[PDB]
Design an enzyme around this catalytic site. Sequence first.
Site, short mmCIF file in Angstrom:
data_model
loop_
_atom_site.label_atom_id
_atom_site.label_comp_id
_atom_site.label_asym_id
_atom_site.label_seq_id
_atom_site.Cartn_x
_atom_site.Cartn_y
_atom_site.Cartn_z
N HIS A 1 0.84 -1.20 0.00
CA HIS A 1 0.00 0.00 0.00
C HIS A 1 0.86 1.23 0.00
O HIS A 1 1.07 1.84 1.05
CB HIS A 1 -0.88 -0.02 1.24
CG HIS A 1 -1.93 1.05 1.27
ND1 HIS A 1 -1.68 2.31 1.70
CD2 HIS A 1 -3.28 1.02 0.92
CE1 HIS A 1 -2.81 3.04 1.62
NE2 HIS A 1 -3.79 2.24 1.15
N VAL B 1 2.67 4.11 2.12
CA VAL B 1 2.00 4.97 3.06
C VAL B 1 1.01 4.14 3.90
O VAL B 1 0.27 3.32 3.36
CB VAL B 1 1.25 6.11 2.35
CG1 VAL B 1 0.11 5.61 1.50
CG2 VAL B 1 0.70 7.07 3.39
N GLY C 1 -5.02 4.77 5.81
CA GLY C 1 -5.84 5.49 6.75
C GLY C 1 -6.89 4.60 7.39
O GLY C 1 -7.22 4.78 8.57
N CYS C 2 -7.41 3.63 6.64
CA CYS C 2 -8.39 2.72 7.20
C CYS C 2 -7.84 1.99 8.44
O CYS C 2 -8.59 1.67 9.35
CB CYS C 2 -8.90 1.73 6.15
SG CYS C 2 -7.78 0.39 5.72
N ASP D 1 -9.12 2.14 12.12
CA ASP D 1 -9.43 0.91 12.91
C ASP D 1 -8.76 0.90 14.28
O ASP D 1 -9.35 0.45 15.25
CB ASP D 1 -9.04 -0.34 12.16
CG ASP D 1 -9.85 -1.54 12.60
OD1 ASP D 1 -11.07 -1.55 12.31
OD2 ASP D 1 -9.29 -2.46 13.23
O1 LIG Z 1 -4.82 6.26 2.23
C1 LIG Z 1 -4.73 7.01 3.51
C2 LIG Z 1 -3.95 8.37 3.53
C3 LIG Z 1 -4.36 9.56 3.04
C4 LIG Z 1 -3.44 10.55 3.22
C5 LIG Z 1 -3.50 11.91 2.84
C6 LIG Z 1 -4.59 12.66 2.63
C7 LIG Z 1 -4.34 13.95 2.29
C8 LIG Z 1 -3.07 14.34 2.20
S1 LIG Z 1 -2.18 12.97 2.57
O2 LIG Z 1 -2.37 10.01 3.89
N1 LIG Z 1 -2.74 8.60 4.07
#
Ligand SMILES: OCc1cc(-c2cccs2)on1
Lengths: 167, 167
Positions: free
Chosen positions: A69, A75, A78-79, A83
């Site tokens: 990912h 990175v 975000g999920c 969680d």
């Molecule tokens: O996929 C999750 C995620 C999203 C972001 C960002 C969003 C906006 C600027 S960086 O960093 N990690």
Amino acid sequence: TKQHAFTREDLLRCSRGELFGPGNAQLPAPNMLMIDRIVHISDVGGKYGKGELVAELDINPDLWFFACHFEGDPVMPGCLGLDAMWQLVGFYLGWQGNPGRGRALGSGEVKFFGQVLPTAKKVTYNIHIKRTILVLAIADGTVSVDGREIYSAEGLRVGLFTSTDSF
Amino acid sequence: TKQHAFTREDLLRCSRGELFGPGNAQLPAPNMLMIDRIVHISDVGGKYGKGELVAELDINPDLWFFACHFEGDPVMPGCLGLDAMWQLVGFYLGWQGNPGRGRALGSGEVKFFGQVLPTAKKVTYNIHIKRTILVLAIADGTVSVDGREIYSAEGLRVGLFTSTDSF
Ligand SMILES: OCc1cc(-c2cccs2)on1
Ligand SMILES: OCc1cc(-c2cccs2)on1
């Protein structure tokens, strides 16, 4: 309500069902577990005065999610940060002494506005308990990396079920 | 905009950066990839008349997340169903011909109200494109398992970035 900090071994113990006992809240085991330790947990303070948690996840470049990912562009998803917050809210319900197994119920508003790169050192979660009541908790949360706020969630909901086999 | 269905191999190709090309949208690779195939994708129809996707994930008892979420109590993490929806919205942006790499930006309201157990056969995702514009997409989504609706998300947001190294 008596113990206010938890090591990784405590959290692993929790994931085996051995912290809160049979039929009670379990953290996920690796690789879904997104917490290394709970630095502080309390039923007072927090932005609503009804409790809060501070928790941490150590980052290193070999965490499994970086390779996939995304390929050539690592990175933290975000999920998974999100969680972590549900995991922590479920843990809080168990820590309070409520019986039952955890299920995330959802969230109000989720925002991602920053990155966890593989060069980062430490992600910190803050959870603010908004309300507890079925048994469920409502909370707000923020994820930070090395001091910088990056994710937020309003109205995180987690519920405890003494039965999940009769839906 | 011309191809309206994608096999798993297409999605794997996408994850390597080989469907949309260098610096453009990538799906995650396994084990974060939560899609087996896109059965239908279009820039018309959907609940806002601005496009929709229908996608599937086959379920079997050996999917990695069942063993660890949770030990003795297997259930697909809702956060991964939610991520499937962000994955699909990001894919849509790439499919539309927009340049840049994907980042989930968050969501409006998320609800989990049903389980994916390891005895399930097939999860189906429906995505309704609400608006496209930085480059970003807003959408609503529902996850279903063997015909039964179980998760929903309103106002899923995903953005495309031609640069992520200068935050
Ligand atoms: O996929 C999750 C995620 C999203 C972001 C960002 C969003 C906006 C600027 S960086 O960093 N990690
Ligand atoms: O941990 C996420 C999750 C939660 C649920 C359920 C929610 C409400 C009834 S079952 O299914 N998956």
